[PDB]
Design a binder for this molecule. Structure first.
Ligand code: HEM
Ligand code: HEM
Ligand SMILES: CC(=N)NCCC[C@H](N)C(=O)O
Ligand SMILES: CC(=N)NCCC[C@H](N)C(=O)O
Ligand SMILES: [Zn+2]
Lengths: 414, 416
């Protein structure tokens, strides 16, 4: 039935009745918990060469349309009943249907709201939705992306946004953004298999040079985009420098930090996920908000398989890197995170630290408890990578489950 | 590929398949519909008081399974001794409704239970456990003697040795042997008039329970609590631990001279005493165990949790940090220094302790050993990854499969 959910810091308890609406299965079973896994083994997004069972697509649609009219307090109204028949009509005749701009906006916001792994969902209602379904080329995707970047960036005063390109069509190819994010630093594999730049982007980097991109030779070279229209070879487009806002990293008191020459971009814009709304799939729907300092300061810069700058900083800090018990790792991680915050604030670019971010997520949980009777959340992804139990979320139990609309992982186009 | 959970390590890109979970003979709280893995106490393992003797039928299969595990472990599966031991257990259950374990079987089961603990990151030490057999114990008084003996062997003047003391199993129509305290060593939690708590808020209940049972309470911030030991069908008796036996460590920072003036301290012996030890169906309601601390348990959870000592702000103020803004990362800075203090103080006092980095690295070694020896290892990510510097340790990047294997350590309802 309904799971009891406790907060070990306050002693409070709540039941989750929202998970009841979950119409999609996760990777867990009573025999064993696989919630710690990042990617689904079967919850993928298999091909769309043959239409989707009208039985299925139709129930999802009726449900989403139902969701939409409850949202505007016009359920059972006339428009509602007639909107349902339109969908019924279109599906029966073509095997698919289309969303109205307004339904799309509602759908995009709900997908974010439902994202179990997002700690910044308190902002879910503030999302600028760019309808890019009137797109027929890779060059057009690029203009749309450039407009999204400009708006989202807004000279450092970041504004959340999503751009939705054409939905998937049976038997036809997908519109796709090959890059995992609109802005990423190249990863160049060198001599002894080592890597210059972002090791996380080695592959996308190689695919780019393999399509005519002239590579640079730095640690932070902004990658070009590989946009792809249905059944066509992806096309390469370089982003106008003045559009890619970046932040040079320096430390408040450690004068030498700026020397490292480290930097990060201001816009976190995930572009390889799929947006599903009422059964319709949007293979290319890039979204962006703003960074929470740990994503850069802890993960991107200190992960062993990423920039892994932990030792360089510890050495410049003159710390005892001989033993683990000197906590040189913990000490250096704290200064790098401080530098990200300080640097972003100094440059007047939006950013939120992990304490403020998780405090605001706690309010969101409360808001959702009242609004829907629960909130799907993935603990491992919600608790910050450093100072975990120093934040409120750590001490809060959570229920993870899939609701629709939703953002989902999808296979790599190559 | 393999029809078992695929487990990946994102740091090293390596993959493995857990086949050991197929051996799980009990479900957890999750379902295809929703994951409840973050719940601390999900009504599943919960070994609730089942007074009436267990289905001889259910106890038999659990018993049969354990015995097979045991003969497997000594490489004698299918042997004559195995079959005879099998017939024996079945006879004893048939006539008495329960059964008993041989000495060597108890030692094996104890170690397996630790080996099987999903929430323990120090399981690389699982094969080195001192099992004190106290199944002959017949009084709260004798319980106190064994416990003192355990603490003395386990403490070993700072050179800590892992151990477990096993008291009599639960019996049909009889009271359970029970240790009311959550740990052989806990600090008192005094409720204040203004509403606050002096000492450790985690033990307020157990503190009021000793008082209600005759303990003359103190008024310190670190008062070692007495033990409430309960023999079958009898009110728990009260016992006070000889101060010389309870080893404690004063906390000082290596470079911050004022930290020591804070008067902070902690005991060296971490000894869980309220968990149930389950082996082949038999239930050991009282079987306290101990090992040694991983610095973050003390430095981060005990001293910095909001509902515990919560000393973060006090230390941050002494460090002259900006505690009015979150972006100054004042909480982080203070946590680090406090964890450093704990580590430094134990090393100075020559008392066994391991930092979160060393510990997680050794747990990664343990995961590899288990992958080969059993085809996997049940682990609870949220509990394995340290409360500070999570992604800085190797386990953070290691996906993990969680499931229940038996023998096992389980939670049990409070005796009162
Ligand atoms: C307003 C600022 C926002 C902040 C501070 C924020 C922060 C985060 C963080 C920290 C994560 C985890 C990242 C990681 O560990 O890889 C995350 C994940 C996610 N967020 Fe947000 N988010 C924000 C806006 C958005 C927006 C506007 C959307 C969508 C419209 C969104 C959708 C998601 C999704 C789907 C994930 C999971 C991605 C994955 O599985 O890799 N977020 N967010
Ligand atoms: C030798 C060093 C040991 C270390 C460093 C170690 C460390 C840990 C840590 C850090 C935890 C989690 C604590 C928490 O977050 O509350 C834990 C949990 C646990 N350990 Fe170990 N452990 C050790 C010895 C033992 C021994 C000897 C046993 C039993 C024979 C054991 C059984 C368990 C169990 C059952 C749990 C979970 C208890 C619960 O649910 O609260 N550990 N251990
Ligand atoms: C919107 C947002 N804040 N985060 C989405 C994920 C971005 C990724 N963790 C990164 O560090 O680039
Ligand atoms: C054996 C061990 N290291 N830990 C068991 C649990 C102890 C508890 N976390 C505490 O901080 O007292
Ligand atoms: Zn689960």
């Amino acid at each position: 039935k309904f799971p009891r959910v406790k907060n070990w810091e306050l002693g409070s308890i709540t039941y989750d009745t929202l998970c009841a609406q979950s119409q999609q299965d996760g990777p867990c079973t009573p025999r064993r918990c696989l919630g710690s896994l990042v990617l689904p083994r079967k919850l993928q997004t298999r091909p769309s060469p043959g239409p989707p069972p009208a039985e299925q697509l139709l129930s999802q649609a009726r449900d989403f349309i139902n969701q939409y009219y409850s949202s505007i307090k016009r359920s059972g109204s006339q428009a509602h009943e007639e909107r349902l028949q339109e969908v019924e009509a279109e599906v029966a005749s073509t095997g698919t249907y289309h969303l109205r701009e307004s339904e799309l906006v509602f759908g995009a916001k709900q997908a974010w709201r439902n994202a179990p792994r997002c700690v910044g969902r308190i902002q879910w209602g503030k999302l600028q939705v760019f309808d890019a379904r009137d797109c027929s080329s890779a060059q057009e995707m690029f203009t749309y992306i450039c407009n999204h970047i400009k708006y989202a960036t807004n000279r450092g005063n970041l504004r959340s946004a999503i751009t939705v390109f054409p939905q998937r069509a049976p038997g036809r190819g997908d519109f796709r953004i090959w890059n995992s994010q609109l802005v990423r630093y190249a990863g160049y594999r060198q001599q002894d298999g080592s890597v210059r730049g972002d090791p996380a982007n080695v592959e996308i980097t190689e695919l780019c040079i393999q399509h005519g991109w002239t590579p640079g030779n730095g640690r932070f070279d902004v990658l070009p985009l590989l946009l792809q229209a249905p059944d066509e070879a992806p096309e390469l487009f370089v982003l106008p420098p003045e559009l890619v806002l970046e932040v040079p990293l320096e430390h408040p008191t450690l004068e030498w930090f700026a020397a490292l020459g480290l930097r990060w971009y201001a816009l976190p814009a995930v572009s390889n996920m799929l947006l599903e709304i009422g059964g319709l799939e949007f293979s290319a729907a890039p979204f962006s908000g703003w960074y929470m300092s740990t994503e850069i300061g802890t993960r991107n810069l200190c992960d062993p398989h990423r920039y892994n700058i932990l030792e360089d900083v510890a050495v410049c800090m003159d710390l005892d890197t001989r033993t683990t018990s000197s906590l040189w790792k913990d000490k250096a991680a704290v200064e790098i995170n401080l530098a990200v915050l300080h640097s972003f604030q100094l440059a007047k670019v939006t950013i939120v630290d992990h304490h403020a971010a998780t405090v605001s997520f706690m309010k969101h949980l409360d808001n959702e408890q009242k609004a829907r009777g629960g909130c799907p959340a993935d603990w491992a992804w919600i608790v910050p990578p450093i100072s975990g139990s120093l934040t409120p979320v750590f001490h809060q139990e959570m229920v993870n489950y899939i609701l629709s609309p939703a953002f989902r992982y999808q296979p790599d186009p190559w």
